[PDB]
Amino acid sequence: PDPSIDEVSKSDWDALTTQEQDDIISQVENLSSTGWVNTSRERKAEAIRSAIAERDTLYSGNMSRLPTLDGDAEYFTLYLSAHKIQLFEGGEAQSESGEGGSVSYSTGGGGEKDLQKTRYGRMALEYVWEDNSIAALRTY
Amino acid sequence: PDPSIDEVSKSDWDALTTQEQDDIISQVENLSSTGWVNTSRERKAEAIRSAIAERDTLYSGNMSRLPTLDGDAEYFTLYLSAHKIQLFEGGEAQSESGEGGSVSYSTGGGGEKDLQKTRYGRMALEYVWEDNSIAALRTY
Amino acid sequence: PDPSIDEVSKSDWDALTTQEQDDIISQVENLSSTGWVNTSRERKAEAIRSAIAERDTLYSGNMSRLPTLDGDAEYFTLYLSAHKIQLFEGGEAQSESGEGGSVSYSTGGGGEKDLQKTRYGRMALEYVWEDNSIAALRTY
Amino acid sequence: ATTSASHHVQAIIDLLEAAPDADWTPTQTPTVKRYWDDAQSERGPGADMPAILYVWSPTTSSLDRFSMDGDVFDQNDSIEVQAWSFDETEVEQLQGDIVQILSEYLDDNEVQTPYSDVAPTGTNDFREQTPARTTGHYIMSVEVETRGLSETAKNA
Amino acid sequence: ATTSASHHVQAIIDLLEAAPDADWTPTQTPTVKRYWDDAQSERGPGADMPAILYVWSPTTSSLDRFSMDGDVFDQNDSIEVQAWSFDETEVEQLQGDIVQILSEYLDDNEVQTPYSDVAPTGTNDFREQTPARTTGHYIMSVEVETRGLSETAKNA
Amino acid sequence: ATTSASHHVQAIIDLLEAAPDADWTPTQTPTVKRYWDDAQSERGPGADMPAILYVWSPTTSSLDRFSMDGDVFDQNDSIEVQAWSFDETEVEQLQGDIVQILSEYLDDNEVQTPYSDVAPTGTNDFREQTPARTTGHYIMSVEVETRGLSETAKNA
Amino acid sequence: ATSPEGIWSNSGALTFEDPADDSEILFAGVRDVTITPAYEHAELYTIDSTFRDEVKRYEHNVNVEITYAKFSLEFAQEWLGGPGATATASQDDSDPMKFNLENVTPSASGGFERTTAVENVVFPELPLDSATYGEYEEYSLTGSGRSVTNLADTSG
Ligand SMILES: [Mg+2]
Ligand SMILES: [Mg+2]
Asked: What is the DSSP letter of B5?
């Protein structure tokens, strides 16, 4: 996209053209083979706007004078977006069964924090020190 | 590929021809018997671009002057790509069933972390000290 | 084969004739009763090329001036290749069921780490001190 | 004769293998197999390979009495052919092809085959079973019956 | 004319897609899909989206001998169309609509479709299954059968 | 006249709701619901409340061809009505009421209903299921078929 | 010559006309239609040979059998009234009502369109009421036309 998802804050996202938003949405839709085609535009836009806001608030600033977001901020925001889109539908699929036949995914077995609950969450989690508390400070 | 996958960063990948990208994609498609043929080209391109960026951000630099990426950076980037593609398709298949019959793929529960959760992840994980903190440094 | 799998590195594999590669592929195909006949040549070639590169980078050199690859480098590279081929196909089946006829293959939990997760890996693992670190050095 | 086979499963394998490349709709002629030629985890083609047809006999062959003489049984045999591919279009084309191949020999008076009749009797779609996330195989099938007079050696 | 499709599932998708917006009872024209277009956790429409119809073939297509010439199978095909929506009345309207749409072509002598006959043969209500606490899809369906003369190439 | 409803489930709900208070045996007129109006853990009445009737279609409706014209389907529809109460006597009375209510309209010329025929075709007792130890609902039901000529788009 | 071909029954458009006008008489809802030109045959045999010496044809008529399920009040009043009149009661006169009949029917492939036309069909008896409990009424006509006026491909 022309503006990248890491180049925009919440107020910037609201200031984008519909085309620039749709380009970013189209990038997020690459992260699933299903593309989430049965969820409407407004909900994917809300998830992205939320991911932007949550990055800028919960995953910003320094920790032992390292950035708290160590990985690529583009892909972090995309994975955080995909995580939110997934949670706008349900959990991870543990099992899916059709008119006939079935598949099951071993998507469980992780911890209890939100990011631990889904595949996109578990990817995003690596970009941000795995939520580890490595901060340090001193008297001067 | 003429430019192999370790010769390029995110901004280089975006500057390659479609032919150079498609040959790298073709190499990644060797890592599964199913080739991920029913996932579109752009989704595989996104996963590769993401793996390139993630390597250069999360799996770069040194620990006690050892490189953080000990194994071949080619096969590491391919495995990291294949891991992401598999997550775009919803993760591992633990079991499958239908009029073709049924199969179960001996996963167990596995580990909690993303690279532990899929076979391509687990192959990539050996290249990077199994994500351990071997780093050591001194006053001088 | 005339050039043996232990005599060739990644660059050498790319320099071999198609027949020399095919002889080595034919040797690898001996390690399964099925021969993996429904997986294409390119995928078996990629698995072998990867196993060669992975041997040379992750399973090379020394610890305490013992070789880190203690066993026969021929059979190590073959078992490492067979491990890779099997992982290009979902891994080991714990069970296979068809037209009523059914079987289960006693794999069990099988640990968590890469080489533990399939039979060919479990064989290859004995060649490399079971991934143990007998490494030792001293001041002089 | 094109087959002269011992048993119905091999007979239909021989018929499908005997088909010219021009009579298949896709670019690549499919590979024909007994259902038990391949292990389950490896069943169906890989990417960059031709589609696979699996042949077997799913139900009991009947052996009806033909007459009081007992020279022959009126034998009725049953077969299923499953087409496996990753392309949902290819399995549909193969279902068409299998019908068009095995709709030759419909009233073969034991000229090409050891049978009076080889006939597709129905077809199945199983594409609804392939889960949409994963790049798993699509499956479709043809059901084939087969009939002839089978010698008893009662009267030597 | 309207379809000329290679298989019954595509043929009925084409018929439902060919329907004018004015012939659908709701404000928004439904989306028509193969059953296997969508993953299970995402099956059915999201809120504010138009309703979804899923088409597939649930049972074996019969091929019967038409005559002892062997030129033709009397082919009988089976389909189900499932309507998914959050609105209990919308699915009921869609069931009415699907029956109406597919009640054209009732004795189409291969003019519109590749068939002699496309007909709704039964309908199902599954609204009783939807749990009342949760927002969740109501489902109803039309069962459709489809009949025609299908060529064998026996006599070329 | 009395209903004019688009679907059989709402049609029979409209009939049961149209019954005068005098035509029910108990003191309180029952409440009529679709099976999916209520969640399971609170399905059936509370104490100090009127008995509840749940209506739904349990099985496939038939659409048979009426003639070569294709102008109409002979449509046969199926419904179940379940009566829920804590009084074993009240459910028995309600079963007798539902029967004698829905035995009006037995041969409408689409006069009251949109049907040729609405008929109770059988009745069920399930009182043996209610565990005697706990307070809990008794259930009984009426099975109702419904038949009429139904239009088509064929001739417009 | 035109290739012989299968015919889907429901494709046929049967109509009746008053031969005084060529005006249509309303008739509908056919289920069975048989039209059969016939002659009596006389065969010559003599002592000179055991084989047939000659065969000749006489007493031409066209047998018409119709089963139908929509009652036509016009058709019945025409049958009662006799040629060029309608009646609400039996008529005490010797002239039966003569109907011109035409049936137009496409081939299953559309390869030809037969028109069969029959002059002066008369029916010895007319069913008025044909009730069976729990069924729609069904009616059988047996009659005889004077000759076939037309049997041709109507296409183009
Ligand atoms: Mg290791
Ligand atoms: Mg990590």
From this structure: T
Beta bridge partners, B102, equal B97, C97
Backbone angles phi, psi at A84, to 5 degrees: -65, -45
> Chain B within 8 Å of A31 (Cβ-Cβ)?
yes
| Tokens, residue D16 | 């499908």
Q: Which two tokens stand for residue B43?
A: 């989704």
Residue G4: Cβ-neighbour burial (10 angstroms; 0-12, 13-18, 19+): exposed
Q: How many Å apart are CA C47 and CA C13, to the nearest integer?
A: 12
Round to whole Å and give the CA distance between C38 and E122. Answer: 43
Instruction: Tell me the chain D residues in contact with residue C104 when contact means C-beta distances shorter than 8 Å.
Output: none
Residue reference for tokens 């008076």:
D109
For ligand 1, the distance from its centroid to the CA atom of residue A129, given in whole angstroms, is: 23
Resolution value (Å, 1 decimal) = 2.4
Contact C13, C56 (CB under 8 A): no
Distance A97 CA to ligand 2 centre (A): 33
Answer for the pair B58, B69: CB distance below 8 angstroms, yes or no. Answer: no
**A71 to B88: CB separation less than 8 angstroms, yes or no:** no
What is the Cα gyration radius of chain D?
A: 17
d(CA C54, CA C76): 11
Task: List chain D residues with CB under 8 Å of A102.
Answer: 131
Q: Are A13 and A52 in contact (CB under 8 A)?
A: yes
Q: What tokens appear for A51 in the block?
A: 């991911």
Quick check: A97 and A132 in contact, CB under 8 A? no
| Inter-axis angle of helices E8-17 and E88-101, nearest 10 | 110
What CA–CA distance (Å, rounded) separates B59 from F126? 67
Is position B12 annotated in a ligand binding site?
A: no
Non-local CB neighbours of A93 within 8 Å, separated by 6+ positions? A105, A107, B90, D133, E39, E40, E41
Experimental method: cryo-EM
